[PDB]
Design a protein around this ligand. Structure first.
Ligand SMILES: *[C@@H]1O[C@H](CO[C@@H]2O[C@@H](C)[C@@H](O)[C@@H](O)[C@@H]2O)[C@@H](O[C@@H]2O[C@H](CO)[C@@H](O[C@@H]3O[C@H](CO)[C@@H](O)[C@H](O)[C@@H]3O)[C@H](O)[C@H]2NC(C)=O)[C@H](O)[C@H]1NC(C)=O
Ligand SMILES: *[C@@H]1O[C@H](CO)[C@@H](O)[C@H](O)[C@H]1NC(C)=O
Ligand SMILES: *[C@@H]1O[C@H](CO)[C@@H](O)[C@H](O)[C@H]1NC(C)=O
Length: 186
């Protein structure tokens, strides 16, 4: 059970004072009966729903083996560290909700590979660096929130970013461009 091993590895590295993940018993045939985990009819994980679960610690790159994952709902916790650089491995993701956490480092360029993504909500973290241009390749994007981070540099208004307005980018370190409220000096 590769998927269960990956999720158990996540449990080890997350900090879970309330033992929300107590049921995450890797001796089971699969993780489909675990609390907060949902599988499809083929017993493959499609949702991890851990919003507002009083978790901290960091994520793990083993998340990338959850090939059928559609929802990664980890918002409103105190998770730290970087967004794993390989989250773009999760090509069936339709929602990536990491908002209201303590993530730092850059937005991974690999997120541009998430060609089915509808929700990308990373607001209210401590993310730094520039927004990857690869994100404009995500033609399905409908809800984007990168506000309240420490992002800097130019933001394009092309591809799917043409859909969004300054509220999606507000209160960063030094963003500029047509979709933001400040033109780029160059
Ligand atoms: C860690 O995350 C919490 C919020 O997350 C919530 O509480 C955790 C303990 C876990 O149970 C999470 O699962 C849960 O979603 C942050 O605490 C919150 O801090 C904010 C301030 O940044 C407080 O918000 C408000 O402040 C404004 C005034 O500016 C008003 O709207 C409100 O009156 C409120 O005070 C909020 O109260 C507070 N929440 C709790 C439960 O303490 C915490 O700061 C964060 N850690 C870090 C380092 O960011
Ligand atoms: C997001 O962060 C900003 C800080 O710039 C804060 O004003 C706002 O209340 C935060 N949102 C939530 C839901 O805590
Ligand atoms: C949008 O324009 C930027 C800058 O030229 C480019 O890097 C990116 O690939 C473009 N995306 C699309 C979908 O055209």
């Amino acid at each position: 059970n590769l998927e269960g091993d990956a999720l158990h590895t996540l449990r080890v590295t997350l900090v879970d004072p309330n033992n929300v993940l107590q049921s995450w018993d890797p001796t089971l045939v699969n993780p489909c009966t675990w609390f907060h985990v949902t599988c499809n009819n083929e017993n493959s994980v499609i949702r991890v729903d851990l919003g507002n679960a009083e978790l901290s610690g960091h994520l793990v790159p083993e998340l990338g083996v959850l090939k059928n994952l559609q929802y990664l709902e980890l918002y409103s916790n105190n998770i730290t560290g970087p967004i794993p650089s390989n989250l773009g491995d999760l090509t069936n993701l339709v929602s990536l909700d990491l908002y209201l956490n303590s993530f730092s480092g850059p937005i991974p360029e690999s997120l541009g590979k998430l060609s089915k993504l509808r929700f990308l909500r990373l607001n209210n973290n401590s993310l730094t660096g520039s927004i990857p241009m690869s994100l404009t390749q995500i033609t399905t994007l409908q809800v984007l929130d990168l506000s309240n981070n420490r992002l800097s540099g130019s933001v394009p208004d092309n591809g799917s970013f043409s859909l969004f307005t300054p509220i999606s980018f507000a209160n960063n370190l030094d963003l500029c461009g047509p979709v933001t409220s400040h033109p780029c000096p160059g």
